[PDB]
Design a protein around this ligand. Structure first.
Ligand SMILES: [Cl-]
Ligand SMILES: [Cl-]
Ligand SMILES: [Cl-]
Ligand SMILES: [Cl-]
Lengths: 314, 314, 314
């Protein structure tokens, strides 16, 4: 039976800190003109299949680059390429028998689990309705660098403020922060709250950690930002535009709610002009571009762990 | 002048058995964590062009994987990519001068021959109107494993029963079976028979073999299945659905017509629910998934033979 | 700051002759079953991004092949893949941070410069509104072979005649010919002349060359072809077809205008039947197919120079 990566919920706190340290390490070596021994030709002769249900160029760029550093071949199968004209069972058994890994994006989560259930090779979740494991790893890599033993990244007592809609990215970030002893506070409009199944996974993630990260739920943005070390948002039709009125991240929101003097900004891209101001996006406060690049380093770490080390994280 | 693979009609019985033994051999070595010396970096620095006229994801998956095991690069050029805005002559001379091989799928057979006629590198037929060489090699690999000197795979006296429409796949399978001393019987509705040009190639394939495979043509399914070791079908609008009434492969058809006690089932995928029953498809009788995977092993064998060994099969 | 290749206008006469000699050299070695030491694994572990705004299969084929000879990975991002749903600044910073090079095709030239302005890796111009650097290198490689010290390819005093529309390809060819001491004469209909910004770059290219190539502008085709060593055209709706009446390259045009006895023909493909006659296109006068293949050799040279040698041409 192969081990899959569907959500941060599948990782112990130790396993998660290790993926992040590895990405940090590989990044420092490769950006100064060297190759890690563990990675050289680790995937040569081998194919990784990328299955995408809707366009996702950004995700493609980093998976593609990560596979190639390991000397493997990335295979793109988009929405014009591939459960419509053939059962989901069949597609799953057949493709997995001629590749070494599947990186997959689909719509509903029920879809990805069924695929993994019958795959004979490790499946990694590129993005689904409720999870986004690769993004969390990138985001914590970024946090770890900017604020620079085995079961921790030394981040205990930090505060993250999320302002906007409750979605896939927040869900996994929340689960990670809890394991790392980081406090999270979430501001959303009435009707756009964290689903209670997600609150259940966050709570279960508390088990066995001596100082877990705490969860705060609010309707008022000025409340969330209080004493925040980092502020995060995300992309949000007619119904929505009126509802998110005061939810735009601005300089005036930080001072008014009382965030830390040196608060930093994060958004996982692409960015539209509704969620955040130009002044904020392009300030020295903004970790946006390093965060985007850390996708490359997070994919290398994850693929080494799940494909090469067949799931034994070290 | 380069040597092409357009049909099993181009192969001697010895050359065909050798391609099958090679695929079997390479499969056993690679699935137990080793590389054959003959294959390592055999295609490095080199590009193989894949030209597809209509979607064919399944074929792509195996060609892509096969090229990469040899350390080469597979280039996908689909129907939005490439004889409409430029003569067929020109396209053929130009592309072939910057690659080492073309794996091509087109509509009419007249199309593929004209391309090959002016290519300066070996062309392999991925699928056309009347032939499908790669499929036959896979199918005989499968048969050879399940029922486990140079001019034979030791299969003399076996029976294959084809029930359904007469198409490209059957044509090449028939030509192969004849060379291998395997008996084939074909049940089709009135109007959907083997074209007499095909019957002519089967008959010509008889020449020089001491015990050739025999051909049987019928309109009644219960007649074909008599004493059959294997039963095969394939995907089959308004006109057709009424015509194939009794043609659905079922448990009740095997017993009624008198097939062997341990008859096995084969279909080259994708499968729809009209040709065969769920009960049959998923039984221990069904070699469907191994048959699908044997495409990978058959491509490695064929590309080694035609591209690396420049057509000298050994 | 990375060095880009946007136009032949960025190259000294020495740098241009060197790119051409290198392509010639690499071509001779590789076509006789050997690898140049400088090229082997030069790009391994590394990704090159290809960004295409409109279909351009021919360009893809040669870039793809060139990258692979160097052991790198080519990544195709077409018009369904990627400044619409995200600022041009953002796309530029993000993609360039996870690849080693961008080969790009866009519409307006203002577009490509802005991309390069913010890229952290070398950008090469695949084709834009006014330039086509890769084509010029191919064309001069071809000329250099057919008519077979450091600041010259030994072509002084040759004549090139362009008959047809004034476009991107002609512009760069003209700038190259000037640096190489080759004479160019241009026949176009009234309304379809070289833009005066281009005439300005040709004139600036004269500076510092002891025998620069001369420019001639005409409305009559029979005038241009006088004493020409080579004749070139290109693809040219309702308004246009009447205007180019006498502009079709023919046997009868050469004799009538008085071109050299052994004049040669060039067209960068694809060809339509309006610009040139079948008799001319397929004669022994036609360097069309070698010219098409020389794209492969020109890409290897250019990518070695700009990506591997980080812009120090040698
Ligand atoms: Cl897609
Ligand atoms: Cl590759
Ligand atoms: Cl296609
Ligand atoms: Cl495109």
């Amino acid at each position: 039976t192969p081990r899959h990566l569907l959500s941060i919920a599948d990782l112990t706190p130790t396993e998660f800190a290790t993926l992040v340290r590895n990405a940090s390490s590989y990044k420092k070596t490769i950006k100064s003109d060297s190759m890690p021994e563990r990675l050289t030709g680790a995937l040569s002769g081998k194919t990784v299949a990328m299955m995408f249900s809707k366009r996702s160029t950004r995700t493609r760029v980093s998976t593609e680059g990560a596979v190639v550093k390991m000397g493997g071949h990335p295979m793109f199968l988009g929405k014009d390429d591939i459960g419509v004209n053939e059962s989901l069972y069949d597609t799953s058994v057949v493709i997995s028998s001629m590749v070494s890994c599947i990186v997959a994006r689909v719509g509903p989560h029920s879809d990805i689990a069924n695929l993994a259930k019958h795959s004979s090779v490790p499946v990694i979740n590129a993005l689904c309705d409720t999870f986004h494991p690769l993004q969390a790893i990138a985001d914590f890599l970024t946090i770890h660098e900017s604020f620079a033993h085995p079961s921790s990244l030394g981040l205990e007592g930090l505060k993250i403020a999320w302002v906007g809609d409750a979605n896939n990215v927040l869900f996994d970030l929340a689960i990670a922060a809890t394991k790392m002893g980081v406090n999270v506070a979430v501001a959303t409009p009435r009707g756009y709250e964290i689903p209670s199944h997600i609150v259940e996974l966050i709570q279960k993630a508390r088990e066995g950690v001596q100082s877990p990260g705490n969860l705060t739920q609010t309707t008022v943005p000025e409340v969330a930002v209080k004493d925040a070390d980092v502020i995060v948002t995300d992309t949000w039709k007619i119904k929505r535009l009126e509802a998110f009125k005061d939810f735009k991240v601005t300089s005036e929101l930080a001072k008014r709610g009382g965030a830390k003097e040196n608060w930093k900004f994060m958004h996982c891209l692409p960015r539209h002009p509704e969620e955040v101001s130009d002044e904020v996006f392009y300030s020295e406060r903004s970790l946006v571009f390093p965060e985007a690049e850390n996708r490359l380093w997070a994919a290398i770490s994850a693929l080494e762990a799940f494909v090469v080390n067949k799931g034994k994280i070290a």
